[PDB]
Write a protein that binds this ligand. Sequence first.
Ligand SMILES: N[C@@H](CC(=O)O)C(=O)O
Lengths: 182, 127
Amino acid sequence: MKILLIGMGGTIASVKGENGYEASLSVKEVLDIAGIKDCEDCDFLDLKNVDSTLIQPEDWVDLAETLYKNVKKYDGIIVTHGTDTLAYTSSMISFMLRNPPIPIVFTGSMIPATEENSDAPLNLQTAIKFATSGIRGVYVAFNGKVMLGVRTSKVRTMSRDAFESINYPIIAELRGEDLVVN
Amino acid sequence: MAVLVIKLIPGLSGDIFRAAVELGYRGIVIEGYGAGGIPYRGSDLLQTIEELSKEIPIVMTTQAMYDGVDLTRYKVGRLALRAGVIPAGDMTKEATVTKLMWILGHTNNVEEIKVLMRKNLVGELRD
Ligand SMILES: N[C@@H](CC(=O)O)C(=O)O
């Protein structure tokens, strides 16, 4: 029923203005530009709005605390993040937030939700579908797959299928409106 | 919580590892070749590690993307074990480094840090 959406920034939130300058959308706007109608009874919470390259270890302590104070209040959490360090964060959170009572799903995109053929809609739709499953823990949703967050690495830099589960089966893969086990 | 991750290349020396420990780095990850190991000739690397391994955690992972590490597979690996190197097993590189940082965040007992890196905490490792 009840989903919390925490924003950290990244390419998913990106918008280039008419000038060298770079602007960021809030997590609420991302969802709406991605064209997500489903998400209902969904809250938003914008922790950061940076390129994930800037992430420091202190940023993780912030995120951990926030998550630890929301895990009882929600059935599912989604965290949108830049792809550059997405897997660093998901791994670290898995260690910090030892035993999560709910699914916590990290996602992002290689193409800003702004543009056409963005992978944002698929990623978010996937994250949300898994945030509402029964399955507690830390995960990455990307290119239609759900992967254990502490077994995920960025494997490609200029390509939709950017993340893989390493030496560990995919938790679930999308197949229409159905999340299939592995 | 300061960790240095250095990629093994042919002829690399232990020089920069002494420097890191002097600089206050509390942990070091080495990205080895294949299933893992250390050169026993061509550099002071192995002696440098046999030295610093007892003082700070020294972790070995693989430069390759899939299949992870096994220091029992080769003599080059076995030597690295004898020198006190902690294997990363089948952990991702992201898991290996964050796991280390998190452990160093509340302990410095190399020997303890070592049993921890070899234990499956959250589903990150086959132990
Ligand atoms: N440099 C970007 C890349 C991305 O999000 O795709 C970031 O990680 O914030």
